[PDB]
A paper describes a structure:
MIF and MIF-2 are highly similar in structure, with monomeric units of 114 and 117 amino acids, respectively, that form homotrimers. An evolutionarily conserved proline at the N terminus acts as the catalytic base for a tautomerization reaction of unknown biological significance in both proteins. The same site in MIF-2 is Phe100 and is also evolutionarily conserved among all MIF-2 proteins, suggesting this site plays an important role in both proteins.
A major difference between MIF-2 and MIF is the replacement of the solvent channel of MIF with a large solvent cavity in MIF-2. Because it is primarily the addition of a large side chain at Phe2 that pushes the channel outward, the solvent cavity of wt-MIF-2 does not contain any more waters than wt-MIF (41 versus 42) despite the expansion in the upper cavity. This is also likely because the bottom of the MIF-2 channel is largely blocked by Arg42, causing this cavity to appear truncated relative to MIF, which instead has a valine at the same position. Another interesting feature is the dense region of waters in a horizontal layer just above the Arg42 side chain of MIF-2. The N-terminal nitrogen of F100A and S62A differs from that of wt-MIF-2 by 1.7 Å and 0.8 Å, respectively. These differences are influenced by tartrate in the wt-MIF-2 active site with two hydrogen bonds from the Pro1 nitrogen to the tartrate carboxylate (2.9 Å) and carbonyl (2.7 Å) oxygens that stabilize its position. wt-MIF-2 is the only protein in this study that has tartrate in its crystallization conditions. Seven wt-MIF-2 residues with atoms within 4 Å of the tartrate were compared with the same residues of F100A.
Author numbering:
A (entry chain A), B (entry chain A), C (entry chain A): 1 to 117
Write the structure that this text describes.
Amino acid sequence: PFLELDTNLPANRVPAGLEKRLCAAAASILGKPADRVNVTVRPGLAMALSGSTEPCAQLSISSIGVVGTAEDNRSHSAHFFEFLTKELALGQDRILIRFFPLESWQIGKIGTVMTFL
Amino acid sequence: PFLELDTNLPANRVPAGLEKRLCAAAASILGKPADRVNVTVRPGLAMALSGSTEPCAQLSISSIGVVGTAEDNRSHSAHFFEFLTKELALGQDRILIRFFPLESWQIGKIGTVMTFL
Amino acid sequence: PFLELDTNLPANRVPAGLEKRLCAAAASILGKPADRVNVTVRPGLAMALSGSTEPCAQLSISSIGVVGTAEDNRSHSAHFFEFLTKELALGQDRILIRFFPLESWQIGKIGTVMTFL
Protein backbone atom coordinates (compact mmCIF):
# COMPACT_ATOMS: atom_id res chain seq x y z
CA PRO A 1 0.00 0.00 0.00
CA PHE A 2 0.93 3.69 -0.35
CA LEU A 3 0.88 6.01 2.66
CA GLU A 4 1.54 9.75 2.37
CA LEU A 5 1.81 11.94 5.47
CA ASP A 6 1.85 15.75 5.27
CA THR A 7 2.59 17.69 8.44
CA ASN A 8 3.39 21.21 9.59
CA LEU A 9 5.54 19.77 12.34
CA PRO A 10 9.15 20.63 11.43
CA ALA A 11 11.31 17.64 10.57
CA ASN A 12 12.95 17.81 14.02
CA ARG A 13 9.55 17.25 15.67
CA VAL A 14 8.81 14.11 13.65
CA PRO A 15 10.44 11.25 15.60
CA ALA A 16 13.40 9.58 13.94
CA GLY A 17 12.43 6.35 12.24
CA LEU A 18 8.73 7.17 11.87
CA GLU A 19 8.56 6.09 8.24
CA LYS A 20 9.82 2.59 9.14
CA ARG A 21 7.48 2.27 12.13
CA LEU A 22 4.59 3.33 9.90
CA CYS A 23 5.43 0.45 7.53
CA ALA A 24 5.14 -2.02 10.40
CA ALA A 25 1.95 -0.38 11.66
CA ALA A 26 0.31 -0.34 8.23
CA ALA A 27 1.25 -3.98 7.64
CA SER A 28 -0.67 -5.10 10.74
CA ILE A 29 -3.61 -2.72 10.24
CA LEU A 30 -4.17 -3.43 6.54
CA GLY A 31 -3.10 -7.07 6.44
CA LYS A 32 -0.39 -6.46 3.85
CA PRO A 33 3.30 -7.45 4.05
CA ALA A 34 5.52 -4.78 5.56
CA ASP A 35 7.90 -5.17 2.61
CA ARG A 36 5.10 -3.97 0.29
CA VAL A 37 4.30 -0.85 2.35
CA ASN A 38 5.44 2.51 1.02
CA VAL A 39 5.52 5.61 3.25
CA THR A 40 6.21 9.22 2.27
CA VAL A 41 6.51 11.86 5.01
CA ARG A 42 6.53 15.55 4.01
CA PRO A 43 7.31 17.69 7.11
CA GLY A 44 7.74 21.44 7.63
CA LEU A 45 4.74 22.35 5.45
CA ALA A 46 2.33 25.24 5.98
CA MET A 47 -0.99 23.73 6.99
CA ALA A 48 -4.43 24.52 8.30
CA LEU A 49 -6.60 21.65 9.47
CA SER A 50 -10.20 22.41 10.41
CA GLY A 51 -9.37 26.09 9.90
CA SER A 52 -6.51 26.08 12.44
CA THR A 53 -2.74 26.32 11.83
CA GLU A 54 -1.80 24.51 15.06
CA PRO A 55 0.35 21.38 14.56
CA CYS A 56 -1.52 18.78 12.51
CA ALA A 57 -1.07 15.96 10.02
CA GLN A 58 -2.86 14.54 6.97
CA LEU A 59 -2.56 10.86 6.02
CA SER A 60 -3.53 9.35 2.67
CA ILE A 61 -3.77 5.57 2.27
CA SER A 62 -4.04 3.86 -1.13
CA SER A 63 -4.28 0.09 -1.64
CA ILE A 64 -5.91 -2.67 -3.67
CA GLY A 65 -8.91 -4.38 -2.16
CA VAL A 66 -8.75 -3.30 1.49
CA VAL A 67 -9.65 0.44 1.70
CA GLY A 68 -12.91 0.40 -0.23
CA THR A 69 -15.57 -0.09 2.47
CA ALA A 70 -16.87 2.11 5.28
CA GLU A 71 -16.83 -0.76 7.77
CA ASP A 72 -13.20 -1.71 7.32
CA ASN A 73 -12.03 1.89 6.85
CA ARG A 74 -13.59 2.61 10.25
CA SER A 75 -11.31 -0.08 11.70
CA HIS A 76 -8.25 1.17 9.80
CA SER A 77 -8.94 4.73 10.93
CA ALA A 78 -9.12 3.76 14.62
CA HIS A 79 -5.76 1.99 14.44
CA PHE A 80 -3.97 4.69 12.42
CA PHE A 81 -5.26 7.40 14.78
CA GLU A 82 -3.87 5.44 17.74
CA PHE A 83 -0.50 5.17 16.02
CA LEU A 84 -0.25 8.76 14.79
CA THR A 85 -1.57 10.58 17.87
CA LYS A 86 1.09 8.93 20.01
CA GLU A 87 3.96 9.09 17.49
CA LEU A 88 3.39 12.75 16.57
CA ALA A 89 2.15 13.93 19.99
CA LEU A 90 -1.03 15.25 18.34
CA GLY A 91 -4.61 15.14 19.52
CA GLN A 92 -7.24 13.28 17.53
CA ASP A 93 -8.66 16.65 16.43
CA ARG A 94 -5.41 17.40 14.57
CA ILE A 95 -5.29 14.41 12.18
CA LEU A 96 -7.37 13.47 9.15
CA ILE A 97 -7.12 10.47 6.83
CA ARG A 98 -8.24 9.85 3.25
CA PHE A 99 -8.62 6.35 1.76
CA PHE A 100 -8.15 5.66 -1.97
CA PRO A 101 -8.81 2.26 -3.57
CA LEU A 102 -6.44 1.31 -6.37
CA GLU A 103 -6.70 -1.22 -9.18
CA SER A 104 -3.83 -3.34 -10.45
CA TRP A 105 -3.61 -1.49 -13.79
CA GLN A 106 -2.84 1.72 -11.85
CA ILE A 107 0.34 0.44 -10.14
CA GLY A 108 3.56 0.59 -12.13
CA LYS A 109 6.36 -1.57 -10.80
CA ILE A 110 9.52 -2.99 -12.39
CA GLY A 111 8.69 -1.40 -15.74
CA THR A 112 5.22 -2.95 -16.10
CA VAL A 113 1.94 -2.82 -14.16
CA MET A 114 0.60 -5.20 -11.51
CA THR A 115 -2.05 -6.52 -13.92
CA PHE A 116 0.75 -8.58 -15.50
CA LEU A 117 2.54 -9.69 -12.33
CA PRO B 1 -12.80 20.08 2.05
CA PHE B 2 -9.12 19.35 1.38
CA LEU B 3 -6.94 21.82 -0.51
CA GLU B 4 -3.33 21.08 -1.45
CA LEU B 5 -1.13 23.74 -3.05
CA ASP B 6 2.27 22.91 -4.59
CA THR B 7 4.47 25.80 -5.68
CA ASN B 8 8.01 26.51 -6.83
CA LEU B 9 7.83 29.88 -5.16
CA PRO B 10 10.20 29.73 -2.17
CA ALA B 11 8.49 29.92 1.20
CA ASN B 12 9.54 33.58 1.55
CA ARG B 13 7.55 34.45 -1.61
CA VAL B 14 4.34 32.86 -0.32
CA PRO B 15 2.63 35.60 1.73
CA ALA B 16 2.42 34.99 5.46
CA GLY B 17 -0.97 33.68 6.49
CA LEU B 18 -1.94 32.31 3.07
CA GLU B 19 -3.13 28.98 4.44
CA LYS B 20 -5.63 30.73 6.75
CA ARG B 21 -6.86 33.09 4.02
CA LEU B 22 -7.33 30.09 1.72
CA CYS B 23 -9.61 28.51 4.35
CA ALA B 24 -11.81 31.59 4.33
CA ALA B 25 -11.75 31.77 0.54
CA ALA B 26 -12.61 28.09 0.10
CA ALA B 27 -15.45 28.36 2.62
CA SER B 28 -17.18 31.06 0.56
CA ILE B 29 -16.43 29.48 -2.83
CA LEU B 30 -17.47 25.93 -1.94
CA GLY B 31 -20.23 26.70 0.55
CA LYS B 32 -18.56 24.76 3.36
CA PRO B 33 -17.75 25.99 6.89
CA ALA B 34 -14.30 27.52 7.22
CA ASP B 35 -13.69 25.32 10.28
CA ARG B 36 -14.00 22.24 8.04
CA VAL B 37 -11.50 23.50 5.43
CA ASN B 38 -8.05 21.93 5.36
CA VAL B 39 -5.17 23.56 3.46
CA THR B 40 -1.68 22.18 2.80
CA VAL B 41 0.93 24.42 1.15
CA ARG B 42 4.17 22.86 -0.12
CA PRO B 43 6.56 25.65 -1.25
CA GLY B 44 10.11 25.62 -2.63
CA LEU B 45 9.46 22.67 -4.97
CA ALA B 46 10.96 22.11 -8.42
CA MET B 47 8.14 22.55 -10.91
CA ALA B 48 7.33 22.85 -14.57
CA LEU B 49 3.84 23.94 -15.55
CA SER B 50 2.93 23.85 -19.23
CA GLY B 51 6.55 22.94 -19.94
CA SER B 52 7.96 26.05 -18.21
CA THR B 53 9.86 26.33 -14.91
CA GLU B 54 8.81 29.95 -14.26
CA PRO B 55 6.99 30.50 -10.94
CA CYS B 56 3.74 28.54 -10.85
CA ALA B 57 1.33 26.73 -8.54
CA GLN B 58 -0.88 23.63 -8.60
CA LEU B 59 -4.05 23.42 -6.50
CA SER B 60 -5.99 20.23 -5.73
CA ILE B 61 -9.47 20.42 -4.21
CA SER B 62 -11.27 17.39 -2.73
CA SER B 63 -14.74 17.48 -1.19
CA ILE B 64 -18.02 15.62 -0.83
CA GLY B 65 -20.85 16.64 -3.10
CA VAL B 66 -19.66 19.99 -4.48
CA VAL B 67 -16.74 19.35 -6.91
CA GLY B 68 -18.34 16.73 -9.13
CA THR B 69 -19.87 18.77 -11.98
CA ALA B 70 -18.39 20.78 -14.84
CA GLU B 71 -20.81 23.65 -14.30
CA ASP B 72 -20.03 24.24 -10.65
CA ASN B 73 -16.31 23.46 -11.04
CA ARG B 74 -16.24 26.22 -13.67
CA SER B 75 -17.52 28.61 -10.98
CA HIS B 76 -15.11 27.31 -8.34
CA SER B 77 -12.21 27.62 -10.78
CA ALA B 78 -12.99 31.27 -11.58
CA HIS B 79 -13.04 32.20 -7.89
CA PHE B 80 -9.91 30.24 -6.93
CA PHE B 81 -7.99 31.73 -9.86
CA GLU B 82 -8.97 35.22 -8.69
CA PHE B 83 -7.75 34.42 -5.18
CA LEU B 84 -4.49 32.70 -6.15
CA THR B 85 -3.34 35.03 -8.94
CA LYS B 86 -3.51 37.99 -6.57
CA GLU B 87 -2.17 36.23 -3.45
CA LEU B 88 0.79 34.60 -5.23
CA ALA B 89 1.41 37.38 -7.79
CA LEU B 90 1.08 34.82 -10.60
CA GLY B 91 -0.60 35.12 -13.97
CA GLN B 92 -3.55 32.91 -14.86
CA ASP B 93 -1.24 30.95 -17.19
CA ARG B 94 0.83 29.81 -14.18
CA ILE B 95 -1.88 28.06 -12.12
CA LEU B 96 -3.79 24.82 -12.64
CA ILE B 97 -6.45 23.17 -10.48
CA ARG B 98 -7.67 19.58 -10.15
CA PHE B 99 -11.01 18.65 -8.55
CA PHE B 100 -11.57 15.31 -6.78
CA PRO B 101 -14.97 14.20 -5.44
CA LEU B 102 -14.85 12.24 -2.20
CA GLU B 103 -17.34 9.91 -0.53
CA SER B 104 -17.97 9.74 3.20
CA TRP B 105 -16.37 6.29 3.56
CA GLN B 106 -13.08 7.79 2.30
CA ILE B 107 -12.70 10.39 5.07
CA GLY B 108 -11.18 9.22 8.35
CA LYS B 109 -11.77 11.53 11.28
CA ILE B 110 -11.65 10.99 15.05
CA GLY B 111 -10.77 7.32 14.63
CA THR B 112 -13.74 6.41 12.42
CA VAL B 113 -15.04 7.47 8.99
CA MET B 114 -17.65 10.09 8.09
CA THR B 115 -20.14 7.38 7.08
CA PHE B 116 -20.76 6.87 10.81
CA LEU B 117 -20.80 10.52 11.91
CA PRO C 1 -0.69 15.63 -18.08
CA PHE C 2 0.30 15.99 -14.41
CA LEU C 3 3.41 14.27 -13.05
CA GLU C 4 4.35 14.36 -9.36
CA LEU C 5 7.66 12.90 -8.15
CA ASP C 6 8.41 12.38 -4.44
CA THR C 7 11.93 11.37 -3.47
CA ASN C 8 14.12 11.00 -0.40
CA LEU C 9 17.11 11.99 -2.47
CA PRO C 10 18.18 15.43 -1.23
CA ALA C 11 17.72 18.22 -3.75
CA ASN C 12 21.46 18.19 -4.51
CA ARG C 13 21.20 14.55 -5.67
CA VAL C 14 18.38 15.29 -8.12
CA PRO C 15 20.12 16.38 -11.35
CA ALA C 16 19.65 20.00 -12.34
CA GLY C 17 16.98 20.41 -14.99
CA LEU C 18 15.18 17.13 -14.25
CA GLU C 19 11.72 18.72 -14.25
CA LYS C 20 12.24 20.04 -17.80
CA ARG C 21 13.66 16.74 -19.08
CA LEU C 22 10.68 14.94 -17.54
CA CYS C 23 8.35 17.17 -19.58
CA ALA C 24 10.09 16.11 -22.78
CA ALA C 25 10.11 12.47 -21.71
CA ALA C 26 6.43 12.46 -20.75
CA ALA C 27 5.49 14.16 -24.03
CA SER C 28 7.00 11.32 -26.07
CA ILE C 29 5.80 8.52 -23.78
CA LEU C 30 2.20 9.72 -23.42
CA GLY C 31 1.74 11.32 -26.83
CA LYS C 32 0.90 14.73 -25.38
CA PRO C 33 2.51 18.09 -26.23
CA ALA C 34 5.46 18.98 -24.01
CA ASP C 35 3.91 22.41 -23.43
CA ARG C 36 0.94 20.71 -21.74
CA VAL C 37 3.08 18.60 -19.38
CA ASN C 38 3.26 19.61 -15.73
CA VAL C 39 5.94 18.21 -13.41
CA THR C 40 6.27 18.64 -9.64
CA VAL C 41 9.38 17.29 -7.88
CA ARG C 42 9.42 17.12 -4.07
CA PRO C 43 12.94 16.14 -2.88
CA GLY C 44 14.47 15.67 0.57
CA LEU C 45 11.45 13.77 1.94
CA ALA C 46 11.49 10.92 4.46
CA MET C 47 10.49 7.79 2.57
CA ALA C 48 10.23 4.04 2.80
CA LEU C 49 9.56 2.10 -0.37
CA SER C 50 8.91 -1.63 -0.06
CA GLY C 51 9.72 -1.30 3.64
CA SER C 52 13.20 0.17 3.02
CA THR C 53 14.46 3.74 3.58
CA GLU C 54 17.23 3.50 0.96
CA PRO C 55 17.03 6.15 -1.79
CA CYS C 56 13.81 5.80 -3.78
CA ALA C 57 11.20 7.74 -5.73
CA GLN C 58 7.43 7.68 -6.29
CA LEU C 59 5.89 8.97 -9.53
CA SER C 60 2.21 9.78 -10.05
CA ILE C 61 0.85 10.38 -13.56
CA SER C 62 -2.59 11.87 -14.23
CA SER C 63 -4.03 12.51 -17.70
CA ILE C 64 -7.17 12.39 -19.82
CA GLY C 65 -7.64 9.37 -22.03
CA VAL C 66 -4.18 7.77 -22.03
CA VAL C 67 -3.53 6.25 -18.56
CA GLY C 68 -6.68 4.18 -18.18
CA THR C 69 -5.69 0.75 -19.54
CA ALA C 70 -3.35 -1.97 -18.30
CA GLU C 71 -1.87 -2.52 -21.76
CA ASP C 72 -0.84 1.07 -22.39
CA ASN C 73 0.15 1.70 -18.76
CA ARG C 74 2.52 -1.26 -19.11
CA SER C 75 4.17 0.61 -22.00
CA HIS C 76 4.23 3.93 -20.14
CA SER C 77 5.73 2.23 -17.08
CA ALA C 78 8.58 0.67 -19.08
CA HIS C 79 9.54 4.03 -20.57
CA PHE C 80 9.27 6.02 -17.33
CA PHE C 81 11.34 3.42 -15.48
CA GLU C 82 14.05 3.72 -18.14
CA PHE C 83 14.05 7.50 -17.76
CA LEU C 84 13.96 7.64 -13.96
CA THR C 85 16.43 4.85 -13.16
CA LYS C 86 19.09 6.58 -15.24
CA GLU C 87 18.27 10.18 -14.24
CA LEU C 88 18.09 9.45 -10.50
CA ALA C 89 20.74 6.69 -10.41
CA LEU C 90 18.19 4.34 -8.80
CA GLY C 91 17.55 0.68 -9.40
CA GLN C 92 14.20 -0.50 -10.73
CA ASP C 93 13.41 -1.86 -7.24
CA ARG C 94 13.47 1.70 -5.85
CA ILE C 95 10.76 3.32 -8.02
CA LEU C 96 6.99 2.92 -8.13
CA ILE C 97 4.41 4.63 -10.33
CA ARG C 98 0.68 5.26 -9.95
CA PHE C 99 -1.61 6.15 -12.87
CA PHE C 100 -4.75 8.28 -12.44
CA PRO C 101 -7.23 8.94 -15.27
CA LEU C 102 -8.78 12.40 -15.26
CA GLU C 103 -11.92 13.79 -16.89
CA SER C 104 -12.20 17.24 -18.43
CA TRP C 105 -14.52 18.54 -15.69
CA GLN C 106 -11.74 17.87 -13.15
CA ILE C 107 -9.14 20.18 -14.72
CA GLY C 108 -9.34 23.87 -13.86
CA LYS C 109 -7.43 26.14 -16.20
CA ILE C 110 -7.69 29.87 -16.96
CA GLY C 111 -10.57 30.29 -14.52
CA THR C 112 -12.83 27.63 -16.04
CA VAL C 113 -12.63 23.86 -16.62
CA MET C 114 -11.53 21.94 -19.71
CA THR C 115 -15.12 20.83 -20.40
CA PHE C 116 -15.69 24.34 -21.79
CA LEU C 117 -12.42 24.77 -23.69
